[model samples]
Target: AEVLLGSSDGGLAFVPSDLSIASGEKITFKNNAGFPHNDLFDKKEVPAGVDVTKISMPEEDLLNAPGEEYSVTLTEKGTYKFYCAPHAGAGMVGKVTVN
Candidate 1:
């Protein structure tokens, strides 16, 4: 499945800001708009026991420009929050609930 992790939807931001998924499912972040955006996990926001360090693409080394995307397979069940580095304060944020 795919999630809009950008400011490009031309609306509020991060289309479907809240998402729900099953554990072990794979989701890709579409950074096709909102140049220089990324779906980066907030280490302090995820549920306990989730190891944020296990991520392959850490923050800062983010997605930029159109067509840029990032994918990650969630194997744990919990609530996770992510933010777009450049537009974080502009309310560019997302949440995932894995069950």
Candidate 2:
């Protein structure tokens, strides 16, 4: 599955605030418009027993142009929340549920 990061006028956001996917599938984040966008998860917001680091997503969180992208395969079953590194508190957040 894929999600887009975009900036419309002066506002920025993840196109889909939430998503669901099968475990072991790939979830790709594409920078469609927002320059310098990044997708990262907070260790504290994830469900119990999930290792956010071991999931291996976004080791280098920087998406600075259109078509720039990053992806990760999720293998654990739970709900995970993330935000753009440069825009976390600005409501540019997203969620993923793996089953």
Candidate 3:
């Protein structure tokens, strides 16, 4: 599955804002517009025992290039919430459900 960070309108957002995938499937997040976008999982909001690190971008690792991507595989069956570190407050958030 693929999710786009930002959009053509130059707005801060996660295209497809929400997603669903089978357990063990991988999701690729692409930087479509907004520069300096990064994925930061909400540690406290994900399923219990999930290792957020497995699905989160490294600290301060912003995506500066258009078409740059970050991918992660989810093996747990639950919902995961995440946001962009810098634009989260601007509604740059998303959710993924692994089932």
Candidate 4:
């Protein structure tokens, strides 16, 4: 898997907007944005399925990591949405469609 890169301004992570992945495929979430940048997801999405816990999802915490990656795997074949812990629901949402 190529290194996945993300950018964040203030405390928000900027992702590619939309992601289409495959089941069991290894993907990396690289935090090259800046400080206060975290790749978080929804808790309902977890039970829905994921390879890594980037964020708490439902009332989740910020997974802050600068110059690093948060590894995740899309296990379920469907559309999954995620966000930055700090900016989640504040227009920092991204999507992943698995096949």
- Model 1: clashing residue pairs? none
> Which prediction has more favorable TM-score, 3 or 4?
3
Off by over 4 Å in 4: 1-13, 44-65
Would you give me the overall lDDT of model 1? 0.77
**Poorly placed runs, candidate 1 (over 4 Å):** 7-12
Model 1: how large is the Cα RMSD against the reference? 1.9
The worst-scoring run of ten residues by lDDT in candidate 1 lies at 4-13
Question: Model 3 residue 46 lDDT?
Answer: 97
- Residue 43 lDDT in candidate 4: 57
Winner of 1 and 4 under TM-score: 1
Give the range where candidate 3 is weakest over 10 consecutive residues by summed lDDT: 51-60
Clashes of each: 0, 1, 0, 4
Ranking by lDDT: 3, 2, 1, 4
> Alpha-carbon error at 44 in model 3, in Å?
0.9
Q: For candidate 3, give the lDDT.
A: 0.90
Give the residue spans of candidate 2 off by over 4 A. Answer: 7-10, 56-60
Q: Write the per-residue lDDT of candidate 1 for residues 1-99, one digit (tens) a residue.
A: 688755454543677789899999998877656567766788998988877767536667867677777888988888998777778788888888999
Q: TM-score of every model? A: 0.84, 0.84, 0.95, 0.64
2 or 4, greater by lDDT: 2
